[PDB]
RNA sequence: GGGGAACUUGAGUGCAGAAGAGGAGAGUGGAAUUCCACGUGUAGCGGUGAAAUGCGUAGAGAUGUGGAGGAACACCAGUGG
């Protein structure tokens, strides 16, 4: 194939990266536990460095070149996929910070020390 | 203190304005959470000081559309009303 977009979710634990179609259909995906970062090493920028490259190898298997990266969530891997996937020979076109922003939503859980 | 009579600053009324998340009522949306239907897609995601229980080859998580349903009403937001 030729074109697709790239979803990245970089939470406090995981850096989950999927390469999907432009109209939302998956091709390849990986994360830190997919490579073998077993513990709480999953949030490191080295983990998103390794995880984005392995998913991009499945894109070369399907030959798509153009990307469209949507960053979702607070973490550390939002810079690493820019460092990885641009160096992966793939065309990074647009970068969004689409965190799903609630207006008020539902009430969050308690603070961790109450 | 009581009675009789006046004055208009106290307080009130008219009139002319201006501000407002003041209350009560019936209705209205918009993101977001989950739930479920399904496509696409594979080995884990989930979580911590560390890790496990829980969830997962019966196809999760991520992702695309669609559906129900509730409650909360970002931005404006300010020793601001």
Alpha helices (H) along A70-113 = 80-87
Determine what percent of chain A falls in helix, strand and coil, rounding each to the nearest 5. 30, 30, 40
Distances (CA, A) of A6 to A55, A72, A108, A111: 10, 11, 29, 33
Structure tokens at A82: 């820019």
Task: Kindly report the number of other CB atoms within 10 A of residue A60's CB atom.
Answer: 13
Determination technique used: cryo-EM
CA distance A49 to A47: 5
| Distance CA A41 to C1' B66 in A | 38
Helices A80-87, A45-62: inter-axial angle, 10-degree rounding? 30
Q: Quick one: CA dihedral A23, A24, A28, A33, positive or negative?
A: positive
Please tell me the total number of residues recorded for chain A in this structure: 114
Beta bridge partners of A19: A6, A28
Structure tokens at A65: 């070149």
A16 in contact with nucleic chain B (CB within 7 A) = yes
Q: Which residue, A22, A9, A13, is CA-closest to A78? A: A9
A26 in contact with nucleic chain B (CB within 7 A) = yes
């Amino acid at each position: 194939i030729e074109s697709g977009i790239a979803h990245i979710r970089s939470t406090f634990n995981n850096t989950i990266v999927t390469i999907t179609d432009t109209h939302g259909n998956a091709i390849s995906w990986s994360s830190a536990g997919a490579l073998g970062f077993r513990g709480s090493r999953k949030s490191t920028p080295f983990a998103a460095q390794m995880a984005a490259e392995t998913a991009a190898k499945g894109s070369i298997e399907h030959g798509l070149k153009t990307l469209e990266v949507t960053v979702k969530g607070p973490g550390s891997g939002r810079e690493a996929a820019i460092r990885a996937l641009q160096a992966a020979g793939l065309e990074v076109t647009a970068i969004r910070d689409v965190t799903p922003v609630p207006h008020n939503g539902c009430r969050p859980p308690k603070r961790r020390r109450v």
